[PDB]
Amino acid sequence: IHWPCRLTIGSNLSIRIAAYKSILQERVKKTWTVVDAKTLKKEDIQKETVYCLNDDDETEVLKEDIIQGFRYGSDIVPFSKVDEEQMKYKSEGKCFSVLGFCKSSQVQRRFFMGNQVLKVFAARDDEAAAVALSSLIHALDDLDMVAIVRYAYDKRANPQVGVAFPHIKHNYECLVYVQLPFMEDLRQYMFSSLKNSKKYAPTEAQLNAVDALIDSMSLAKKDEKTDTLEDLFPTTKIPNPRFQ
Amino acid sequence: GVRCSLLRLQETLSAADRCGAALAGHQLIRGLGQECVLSSSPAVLALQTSLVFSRDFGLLVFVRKSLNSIEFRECREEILKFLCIFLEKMGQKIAPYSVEIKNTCTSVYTKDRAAKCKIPALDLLIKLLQTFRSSRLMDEFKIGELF
Amino acid sequence: KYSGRDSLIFLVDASKAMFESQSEDELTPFDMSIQCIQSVYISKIISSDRDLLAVVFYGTEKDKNSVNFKNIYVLQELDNPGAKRILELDQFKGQQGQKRFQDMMGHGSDYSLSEVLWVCANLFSDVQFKMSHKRIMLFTNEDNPHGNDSAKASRARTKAGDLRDTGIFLDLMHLKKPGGFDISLFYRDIISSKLEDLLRKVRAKETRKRALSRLKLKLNKDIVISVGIYNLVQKALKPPPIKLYRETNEPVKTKTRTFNTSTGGLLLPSDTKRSQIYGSRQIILEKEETEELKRFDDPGLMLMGFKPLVLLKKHHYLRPSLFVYPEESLVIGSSTLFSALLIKCLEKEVAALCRYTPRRNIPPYFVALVPQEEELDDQKIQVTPPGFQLVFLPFADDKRKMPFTEKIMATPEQVGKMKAIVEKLRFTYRSDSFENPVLQQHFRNLEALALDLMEPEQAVDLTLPKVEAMNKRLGSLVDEFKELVYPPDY
DNA sequence: AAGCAGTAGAGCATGC
DNA sequence: TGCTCTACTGCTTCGATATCG
DNA sequence: AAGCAGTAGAGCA
DNA sequence: GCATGCTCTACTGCTTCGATATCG
């Protein structure tokens, strides 16, 4: 499915950009349907909830008594619905801005945190804009300089910052976007290290044993006098057993 | 010597410090469980079952009161598992004090949350209806609603 | 301890001089102290809302405690942070708040001694939970409360020795009487200034350390190693939306059922089956069969050989990466093999491949296990965990495909101009600090009805860029960078 | 998953 | 006759719901 | 339960 | 040689909090 938008760098570098989705946690598209015994049917089943103030001997209430109360410390406060409809949060439509760039390769391999990854790709219709982005990425590709994009989908959507990795290949020239954490999702706690140990030192015969282990349990093999790696067992083409 | 700790337990609960009322209630209910089972003279046993059973004050109204709390769990639990030894120190002579205990245990089940105390209510009902068999004394309890 | 907690006694000086305006007209240190106290409670009401707090004023005329000694008066008992307790602590601001303090107690006496440390100790000696940290942040100014008699100071340092016997840690916040390090008096055989941190660097966080899973890894069929699988990007969001009955301020606790086969009554969940429908034919199952068909393996991890770190491209991921570590609770002495395997994986750059079933019943997923080593220096700079990291790989229908039929060239002149632009816009990325807009405005919006100050404080956005501060960092190369080799010109 | 308590099949010392 | 609306529509987003360790 | 842009049927013509 | 007075620690179970699949 095609996705159009407009990338901006600074004040006015508005370049119309198309984008597509990539690897996503795939799910089924059929609902288990409740069927009572003796009927083999559904429509003769009423499944419902009752709004029942217990607290006491019960007095069964209706739905127009409901303040969507929230927790605060040691009490529970109102502001059910229209108050948060007033003082909710907005971020004025869709946006694909650039915060800045970073020449350091300190965005590590372990902070990606995304339920989907994006390819901002090109545009269509006499793509001088996309050859401008080709110039952009053919400049960006030489050094470890990445982009920190702020992305949102609509006013219902939430804002999220993330990395835009370069991707220069044979037929396609892509930029691939992944999300990033906020400083509320990190947590960092102390661990006991193992290098300076008094009881957990392994000796050299055991070291050579695990060296023989990691030798003789390998999977990659090199040949044909060019030393490009031949590896079997590609866990990216193997189908998933569940839906099968 | 009793009813001193009864009114002490009745009056110590209304103010704040809802752990002090819990510890005092534990001590005084232990006192009642010590000083009522020990007696054996039968008219004085009738005096005790006419002392702890009053329509204004007593254990039934005290456990009726502070159920809208969470701090009176240990004392209420001791009461509700003490009454299944008090239904076995005596017998079918308690029969004109029965339906109040049935309604007490029924509301205590359908009103509380924790099954540290929800099961002993069903213990008192499952002891009581096992005792008082199918007679005239089964028409007070509306079985058609209980089922 | 996991469900253990930390206490905090806030001791406030009021005898003679801290109530003084320092012959200035900016602010008094007393109201500065009340600013700091109200900010740390407005932080820990949502940050760490199970610690134990207390606040004690010393030196005044009256005294209410549990031991009845002079010049010691408390207002709060060791407890959770209470919004009513902070709505009664916020009234001590301004001249009328100072007047309110003056007409409910006043101040000034031959003030306390060792006895205020005594009432701190007996405040600690009463609460029956588990304790880990026990800190006293004293709010005082002077540097000799023993300015006339030596027995006061001798018994004070002996009492501090007896409090450090059980180890109760006190470290004051010295006010700015010289604004820094000049009055270095003999307040040093008791303990073992900076307040803007406590004023605003604690806005909205959470703290927890659990384990999330305790599994085992099987190499062949008989090499069992016990591991724990922690999570380190929690993906937090707001506390849940409770329902409330209208007037009497009570919850509802609703119910649900299913019935009505056009006869009325009540149907139990025992007579219930599941089904799927294609057009006319419906395949019927029981719920045991439905939960049975998602059964492929035992709970655990399964080794499937090794790989070098060259093919698993960082284009591939589908999961927030977890972290795994060995524990000597189930299988005795498996960290020895883990330390050896760690050493040879960091010496020979190799990384393993495994099959993953975390819970007791789940279809499998292929994972890859990547080594990782700590970093450290003299300041206990523990920033990276020693162990393994789990990258998750897709299988079959995830990697879709684009129409693929596009390829145009470019020309190498714009590389240096873009280098100039990226070096104008260059910065080291971060170490923290990109806080959440929606959650920050939500917690301030909750705070506005919590303490009813005036209104929602407009929580400042931080995800937006400073457009003018990159306009002037850039300059007037924007139009030539547009139309140097690509003029639109309609 | 952490943790928190309390029952209870299972034995020892004793009486009729 | 082509443009301009117009009800639908696939498809996405959180959101309250349900399960478990 | 909510929105957003694509895509075949009316209305003035 | 059968039916009671008296200790006993491992097993199991509920609560508390946190994390993940789900229909809409």
Assign C177 to helix, strand or coil.
coil
In this complex, which residue's CA is closest to the C1' atom of nucleotide F4?
A: A154
- Contact yes or no for C340 and A229 at CB 8 A: no
Q: What is C235-297's CATH topology?
A: Ku70, bridge and pillars (4.10.970)
Q: How far is the CA of A48 from the C1' of E17 (A)?
A: 13
Q: How far is C190 from C225, CA to CA, in rounded Å?
A: 49
Which run of H or of E encompasses C367? Answer: strand C365-372
Whether A7 contacts A122, CB under 8 Å:
no
Provide, as residue numbers in chain A, all residues whose Cβ is less than 8 Å from the Cβ of B112.
none
Q: Is C134 a catalytic residue?
A: no
Q: What is the dihedral of CA C68, C70, C72, C73, to 10 degrees?
A: 70
Q: Where in chain C are all domains bearing CATH 2.40.290.10?
A: 207-234+298-395
Amino acid letter, residue A131: V
Q: Where are the alpha helices (DSSP H) in chain A?
A: 82-86, 128-140, 204-216
Q: Where in chain C are all domains bearing CATH 3.40.50.410?
A: 5-206
Nearest CA in chain B to A55: B111
Whether C384 contacts C346, CB under 8 Å:
no
Long-range contacts of C373-380 (CB under 8 A, 24+ apart): C373/C342, C373/C346, C374/A191, C374/A193, C374/A195, C376/A193
Q: How far is B118 from B121, CA to CA, in rounded Å?
A: 6
Q: Where in chain C are all domains bearing CATH 1.10.1600.10?
A: 396-490
Query: Which of A97, A102, A113 is nearest residue C465 as measured by Cβ atoms?
Result: A97
C490 touches chain A (CB under 8 A): no
Q: How far is CA C152 from CA B124, C144, C188, in A?
A: 64, 11, 16
Say which residues have a Cβ less than 8 Å from residue C289's Cβ, sequence separation at least 6.
none
Q: How far is CA A113 from CA A88, A177, B102, C313, in A?
A: 26, 11, 57, 16
User: What single DSSP character describes residue B19?
Assistant: T
C105 touches chain A (CB under 8 A): no
Per DSSP, the residues of C442-465 read HHHHHHHHHH--SS---PPP-SS-
Assign B43 to helix, strand or coil.
helix
Q: How far is B103 from B63, CA to CA, in rounded Å?
A: 12
Sign of CA dihedral C377, C381, C386, C388: negative
N-to-C CA span, chain B: 43
Taking the CA of residue C321 as centre, how many other CA atoms within 13 Å lie in the half-sphere pointing to its CB? 21
User: What single DSSP character describes residue C247?
Assistant: T
Q: How far is A96 from A4, CA to CA, in rounded Å?
A: 11
Question: Which residue among C1, C235, C314, C466 is the active-site one?
Answer: C1
Tokens in use for B77?
């639990």
Decide: CB of A38 under 7 A of nucleic strand F. no
Q: In degrees rounded to 5, what are phi and psi of residue A170?
A: -75, -60
Axis crossing angle, helix C150-166 with helix C114-124, rounded to the nearest 10: 20
A56 touches chain B (CB under 8 A): yes
Q: How many residues comprise chain A?
A: 244
Min Cα distance B132 → chain A (Å) is: 26
- Residues A207, A211, A217, CA angle at the centre, nearest 5°? 145
User: What CATH code is assigned to C207-234+298-395?
Assistant: 2.40.290.10
Resolution in A for the shown PDB structure?
4.1
* Class of the domain covering C5-206: alpha beta
Q: How far is the CA of C4 from the C1' of D4 (A)?
A: 14
Query: Which of C344, C429, C450 is nearest residue A214 as measured by Cβ atoms?
Result: C344
Window A:54-93, CB contacts with C under 8 Å:
54-55, 61, 65-80, 84, 87, 89, 91
Give the bridge partners for C215, in sequence order: C227
Maximum distance among all alpha carbons in chain C?
100
Whether C422 contacts A103, CB under 8 Å:
yes
C359 touches chain A (CB under 8 A): no
Chain E, protein-covered positions (CB within 7 A): 11-18, 20-21
Provide, as residue numbers in chain C, all residues whose Cβ is less than 8 Å from the Cβ of A38.
271
The strand pair at C272-278 and A59-60 is best described as: unpaired
A60 touches chain B (CB under 8 A): no
Whether A70 contacts C446, CB under 8 Å:
yes
Q: What is the dihedral of CA B138, B141, B143, B144, to 10 degrees?
A: 120
Tokens in use for C160?
């501090």
Whether C343 contacts C316, CB under 8 Å:
no
Axis crossing angle, helix A204-216 with helix C335-348, rounded to the nearest 10: 60
Min Cα distance B107 → chain A (Å) is: 7
Q: How far is C383 from A96, CA to CA, in rounded Å?
A: 32
In this complex, which residue's CA is closest to the C1' atom of nucleotide F2?
A: A156
Whether A60 contacts C271, CB under 8 Å:
no
- Residues C29, C35, C38, CA angle at the centre, nearest 5°? 140
Long-range contacts of C149-154 (CB under 8 A, 24+ apart): C152/C113, C152/C114
Per DSSP, the residues of C62-98 read --BSSS--TTEEES--SBS--HHHHHHHTT--HHHHH
Q: Which residues in 101-140 of chain B line strand G, with CB less than 7 A from it? A: 113-116
Which of B64, B109, B111 would best serve as a mutation to test chain A binding (most A beta carbons within 10 A)?
B111
Q: Residues followed by a break in chain A, C–N over 2.5 Å?
A: none
A27 touches chain C (CB under 8 A): no
Chain G, protein-covered positions (CB within 7 A): 14-15, 17-20, 22-24
Provide, as residue numbers in chain B, all residues whose Cβ is less than 8 Å from the Cβ of A56.
111
N-to-C CA span, chain A: 25
Burial of A129 (0-12, 13-18, 19+ CB in 10 A): buried
What technique was this entry resolved by? cryo-EM
In this complex, which residue's CA is closest to the C1' atom of nucleotide G24?
A: A31
Q: Which residues in 180-239 of chain A line strand F, with CB less than 7 A from it? A: none
Q: Which of C404, C311, C299, C316 is nearest to C349 (CA)?
A: C311
Q: How far is C328 from C301, CA to CA, in rounded Å?
A: 18
Q: Where are the alpha helices (DSSP H) in C8-149?
A: 29-44, 83-89, 94-104, 114-124
Per DSSP, the residues of A111-130 read ----S--EEEEE--SS-HHH
- Residues C241, C244, C250, CA angle at the centre, nearest 5°? 130
Please list, residue by residue across C22-47, b when 16 or more beta carbons sit within 10 angstroms of its beta carbon and e when fewer do: eeeeeeebbbbbbebbbebbbbbbbb
Chain D, protein-covered positions (CB within 7 A): 1-4
Q: Where in chain C are all domains bearing CATH 4.10.970.10?
A: 235-297
Nearest CA in chain A to C50: A73
A84 touches chain B (CB under 8 A): no
Q: In degrees rounded to 5, what are phi and psi of residue B76?
A: -65, -35
Q: How far is C113 from C71, CA to CA, in rounded Å?
A: 10
Whether C233 contacts A115, CB under 8 Å:
no
Q: How far is the CA of C214 from the C1' of G19 (A)?
A: 14
Whether domain C396-490 has CATH 1.10.1600.10: the reply is: yes
Q: How far is A185 from A160, CA to CA, in rounded Å?
A: 13
A172 touches chain C (CB under 8 A): yes
